[PDB]
């Protein structure tokens, strides 16, 4: 339930019309190491830290 902050790893490029949204393959640097996927708005790059409110969500 607690939004846990995430460490970004590999980015799979824009995945939308009009751009804006970008794909990502984050993972938990909280010692969990769960390489999951997520969607992100605005500029982003490697090593970025993100706060996910849904501990478990998927997209592709």
């Amino acid at each position: 339930p607690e939004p846990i902050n995430a460490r970004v790893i590999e980015v799979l490029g824009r995945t939308s019309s009009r751009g804006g949204i970008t794909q990502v393959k984050v993972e938990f640097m909280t010692g969990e190491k769960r390489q999951i996927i997520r969607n992100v708005i605005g500029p982003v790059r490697k090593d970025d830290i993100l706060v996910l409110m849904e501990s478990e969500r998927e997209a592709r």
């Binding site: 708005i41 830290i49 993100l50």
Partner: peptide
């Protein structure tokens, strides 16, 4: 409209 996360710089 869907709920997406946000980049730090935008924040």
């Amino acid at each position: 409209r869907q709920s997406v996360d946000v980049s730090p710089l935008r924040r």
